[PDB]
């Protein structure tokens, strides 16, 4: 119950910032644009320098227009709202938000370890132990997130940033929604998508549970349990609920996955009575000190290495596209509350 007690204070805290969110906390002029750190479906993430403090940050830039044409208004407002309110060790910290004629911005804490992905891809696979360590932190993160009526919707190695201490940082909240009850938007990353989503059934918190299981699998095996060259081909597999585990997985891991990768909601771990505790209590997580993990007192099995302040060596190289600002304020009514 130290949890049930902890979250209580968590909730209270979230509620407040949720009702009274932060608006226009800065201006482009205070920032020095360095390199592109990465890309997403709605915009780019650049490495930034804060002139006066001398701090570097990752800055999420969105083009008012693109968001509109792609219909991401609600989602974009959702992301800043929710982000500016949460507070957990495994989620990125947003520091400044603000807009201008042309774009929307989100200044976040710069996580230099680079993406989980890049490392995952390089190394090949993760030792179940190395996996667990990461898992465990997503397990805790969902626990917090969910208790706030929040739904993540985009877990994928590409969104899991490795920090100076080799701990996770979940970035990109663009599909995260505060929602009591069912939701219906079709969004996410194909490989991670839950069946209920594809099938357009209306879905809940449990989708986040399925992605966890896809995550653990991609972590420990080297590939996703459902892959093909076109998303469609992927979809058919997901709804197929037919999964092959590598000969190298423990009977334990298999067990977990089978339950997370459950096509049936009234049967999928995470969505049951005991809720999370079905997961946390799993034999797989037998050697897990949830506290130490939370406390960031655990054994970082791997520590990316950062040369200096503003080192973009754990990130790929991107093409640079000049960001401009219209002398005409665009799409202002749609973004009143940003």
């Amino acid at each position: 119950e130290s949890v049930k007690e902890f979250l209580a204070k968590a909730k209270e805290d979230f509620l407040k910032k949720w009702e009274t969110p932060s608006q226009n906390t800065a201006q482009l002029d205070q920032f020095d644009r360095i390199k592109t750190l990465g890309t997403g479906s709605f915009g780019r993430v650049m490495l930034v320098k804060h002139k006066e403090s001398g701090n570097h940050y990752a800055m999420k830039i969105l083009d008012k227009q693109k968001v509109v044409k792609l219909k991401q208004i609600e989602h974009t407002l959702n992301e800043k709202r929710i982000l500016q309110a949460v507070n957990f060790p495994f989620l990125v910290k947003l520091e400044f938000s603000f807009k201008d004629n042309s774009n929307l911005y989100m200044v976040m804490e710069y996580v230099a370890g680079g993406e989980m992905f890049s490392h995952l891809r390089r190394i090949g696979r993760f030792s179940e132990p190395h996996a667990r360590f990461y898992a465990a932190q997503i397990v805790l993160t969902f626990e917090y997130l969910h208790s706030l009526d929040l739904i993540y919707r985009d877990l994928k190695p590409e969104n899991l940033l490795i920090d100076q201490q080799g701990y996770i940082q979940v970035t990109d909240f663009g599909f995260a929604k505060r929602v009591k009850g069912r939701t219906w938007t079709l969004c996410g990353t194909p490989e991670y998508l839950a069946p209920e989503i594809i099938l357009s059934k209306g879905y809940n918190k449990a989708v986040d549970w399925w992605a966890l299981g896809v995550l653990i699998y991609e972590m420990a095996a080297g590939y996703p349990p459902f892959f093909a060259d076109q998303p469609i081909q992927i979809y058919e597999k997901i709804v197929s609920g037919k999964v092959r585990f590598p000969s190298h997985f423990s009977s334990d891991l298999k067990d977990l996955l089978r339950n997370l990768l459950q096509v049936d909601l009234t049967k999928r771990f995470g969505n049951l009575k005991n809720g999370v505790n079905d997961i946390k209590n799993h034999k797989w997580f037998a050697t897990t000190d949830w506290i130490a993990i939370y406390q960031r007192k655990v054994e970082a099995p791997f520590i990316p290495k950062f040369k200096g302040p503003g080192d973009t060596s754990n990130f790929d190289d991107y093409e640079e596209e000049e960001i401009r600002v219209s002398i005409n304020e665009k799409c202002g009514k749609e973004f009143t509350e940003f």
Partner: peptide, 20 residues
């Protein structure tokens, strides 16, 4: 090998999210 199958595949790079 599946791994073998995965590497030749078209989605080994960074995966974009789907709007619609």
């Amino acid at each position: 090998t599946t791994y073998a199958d995965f590497i030749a595949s078209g989605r080994t790079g960074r995966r974009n999210a789907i709007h619609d």
